[PDB]
């Protein structure tokens, strides 16, 4: 009987494993920008700066 | 009066032809062997 029994839950715990296909997507979108404008000054005989 | 083997699992008896009879009775009586019970039971978890 206990022969019965565990080749009952030996046949359940022996199925087949589905198998998943795990893709990841990575998306990753940098952007920049910048204006660095001046104007500047200077007299180096008496110095004198802007 | 009663025996039996459990090398053969096999009543023996000492007694009547009425116990022949009486006891071929029982010789059939409890022969029965009960259908499964699924006493143990794999569950397949869903989710947790």
Redesign the interface.
Known sequence: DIM??MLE?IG??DIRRAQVLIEALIVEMAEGDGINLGVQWGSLESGSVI | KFVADERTNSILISGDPKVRERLKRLIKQLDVEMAAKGNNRVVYLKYA
């Open positions: 019965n029994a839950v359940q715990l």
